[PDB]
Design a protein around this ligand. Structure first.
Ligand code: B7X
Ligand code: B7X
Lengths: 376, 379
């Protein structure tokens, strides 16, 4: 019985989407804030610097019209956010999971475990229960519901699925990360300009992977191997990155120190993960980086001395989807595999053998996952 | 069968808020402090409910001073999530820390040896979570591998065992601190004649935290295993969400629990027992020691009657219900501790009342059922 493998990846987004170039006009128009000219220009500059071209969003103009409190900055809004998310998040997860199961090509009743991960709404029973119902799985699927984790949680889910797959003979784990900015969408406010950053960053999406050890020959086709997974955090990280669930929905606290602190700390995580494997040249790896913002992508690239194309897949996902929180890295996994096929390369990791997936989030938590590629 | 083998419970500790209220005097307290003494018939109905809970006292994070300073907590529906969060986001990690200190004290190994932390609660959420805060409070290092289990519910004690088993068995040398910390402050609210069923919740739930140390391959002469986690399986009764559900709203945590719940649970526990214990060749439920989640006294009685258990099998369960009320996911861990302590008091030879195999059964939202087969250890 050997290492946990990624056996399939699927993704899904809400049909509704908005291009970033026209997003300042849409945002200030639909929140009835067009009289705030200077704030609107600042938001234009922020959106132009995000390096995001479009984002998919569960919230439509129609939903904003039916619920004007969503367009305020602080009015009570958690109840409508919950009414939307408790229903929509399992459905988006279901779409991603169906695509993953189709690639996997095994019967869905063979799934033994489900791990569902989100920070967009909570409920009891959780989204895992709803997804079991929506997918037509049996009640004997072993569920784990990971609520309110954040951006770093893609790495966390890989870390968890590794143990689930390697310690249970024959286990097949459906892992789903589903996120929506509807939990934190709110109108602009000159008293709280930094929140504009969040309103420019976050998009909606779900990713699903199938994880398992001991692949069936001629039936399953491994995509990646989860070699190792480790978490840490930068002390006092909660003073720099934190999000609270309030009557106004999810709040956002992110100091300017965050990108340089993360970039400052990633090399020790890389060393701790890769020295036991005898790897020290970070450009000998393929890369998956959580694109918390374009600044962090650039600063990790510069601090580590990575060739500019290493983070191409990361940038692609940012460009096409924005920050989808824990789902991002999984999207990027798919992209780096798809890109590898388009370039005619021989492995799922851009022709390289070893790679690293690095994610980060609230508390300056950092997840480091070492991956091994597979034949394309 | 191996020593690099199954996950073991190596220590159990518990903690409760200092403030407590007797159940006999709780109707008077509840209707006085929520300014509802004009609701005489509702108060009498609440008296009957509290009399049937079989609870003697509950420990509470909410004091009279906190309730008076925040009248929205004493209403039924006014916006209250923010004050509940301000209380819980701070208090739940502290209570978890107290339980963890007790568990580490029994464990008697240096806390820096803990490699994993699993934190479990349904009382408030935050990012970063209560696990992060507990790392800070306990003085552990940032390299402890954390898993934060928010908004799980009553059954999650079983879930945590199910999780720790894998963490311990797939990571050589790993030592996992598991913490379940719960407070009824997330769902406390004033009474309402339009919503009489909520009175049930107001009579049931108490506050408390439990902590265990879980690990494989115990160190000889240093660690003293308490229980062995033989197996762990989850299921649910189809359409269970229609019978038991709780939603987090601007008014805090709501409560939906039909009268069908105890009979449906009792009806379904035997198939879980059979599925878990037939591979071990066990079919006599009275040959086991028992840990049952006391979601209510009715469920305890109906499981006893449906399975034909000797009346003393659920004594530890009833003891914890009596002395603490329903502490949600923490309950079963409390009961684990109690069944071990009781075994010492009665002079029995194993931590499971002198028996070899036992079962821990918990249940919660969605009619989810967790079934954990346990093996005792020499006392
Ligand atoms: C998700 C997560 O974990 C939780 C979850 O959702 O589940 C995450 O990953 S969140 C982590 C995201 N972090 C960031 O995006 C870091 C934010 N960026 C910064 O702090 C930096 O200061 C930048 C380098 C991005 C700012 O410079 P940039 O190169 O982008 O553009 P410049 O011209 O400065 O900036 C344009 C305007 O942006 C304003 N601004 C940037 N960042 C902030 C923050 N953090 N707070 C408030 N304002 C910010 C700049 O002031 C600048 O203003 P201007 O009006 O032109 O003077
Ligand atoms: C009826 C009986 C109580 C067995 O009988 P009893 O001996 O216990 O008392 P009783 O004779 O019913 O008298 C009590 C008075 O209350 C009324 N009444 C009772 N029950 C309900 C109810 N359900 N709805 C509405 N009205 C109810 C009843 O009509 C009567 O009114 P009156 O007759 O005075 O008019 C039992 O079937 C039952 O439903 N028990 C509920 C206990 C229970 O299941 N708790 C689950 C907790 S879930 C958990 O653990 C946590 C999590 O999962 C998640 C998390 O928190 O994280």
């Amino acid at each position: 019985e050997g290492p946990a493998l990624v056996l399939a990846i699927g993704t899904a987004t809400p049909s509704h989407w908005i291009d970033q170039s026209s997003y300042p006009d849409y945002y200030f128009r639909v929140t009835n804030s067009d009289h705030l000219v200077d704030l609107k220009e600042k938001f234009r500059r922020i959106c132009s610097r995000t390096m995001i071209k479009k984002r998919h969003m569960l919230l439509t103009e129609e939903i904003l019209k039916k619920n004007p409190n969503l367009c305020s900055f602080s009015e009570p809004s958690l109840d409508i956010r919950q009414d939307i998310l408790v229903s929509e998040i399992p459905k988006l997860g279901k779409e991603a999971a169906l695509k993953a199961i189709q690639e996997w090509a095994q019967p869905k009743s063979t799934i033994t475990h489900l791990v569902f991960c989100t920070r967009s709404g909570v409920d009891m029973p959780g989204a895992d229960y709803q997804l079991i119902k929506l997918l037509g799985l049996g009640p004997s699927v072993q569920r784990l519901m990971m609520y309110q984790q954040g951006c770093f949680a893609g790495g966390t889910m890989l870390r968890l699925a590794k143990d689930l797959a390697e310690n249970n003979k024959g286990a097949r784990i459906l892992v789903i990360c589903a996120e929506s900015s509807a939990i934190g969408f709110r109108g602009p406010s000159e008293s709280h300009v930094d929140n504009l950053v969040a309103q420019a960053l976050f998009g909606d999406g779900a990713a699903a992977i199938i994880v398992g050890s001991n692949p069936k020959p001629g039936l399953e086709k491994p995509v990646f191997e989860i070699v190792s997974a480790a978490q840490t955090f930068v002390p006092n990280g909660d003073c720099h990155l934190a999000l609270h669930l309030r009557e106004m929905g999810l709040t956002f606290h992110c100091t300017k120190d965050v990108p340089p602190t993360i970039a400052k700390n990633v090399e020790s995580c890389l060393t701790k993960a890769l020295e036991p494997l005898g790897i020290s040249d970070w450009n000998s790896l393929f890369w998956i980086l959580h694109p918390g913002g374009n600044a962090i992508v650039d600063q990790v690239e510069n601090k580590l001395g990575l060739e500019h194309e290493k983070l191409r897949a990361t940038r692609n996902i940012l460009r096409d989807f924005g920050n989808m929180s824990s789902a991002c890295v999984l999207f990027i996994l798919d992209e780096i595999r798809k890109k590898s096929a388009r370039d005619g390369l021989k492995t799922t990791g851009e022709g390289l053998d070893f790679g690293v997936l690095l994610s980060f989030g609230p508390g300056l938590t950092i997840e480091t996952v070492v991956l091994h590629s597979k034949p394309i």
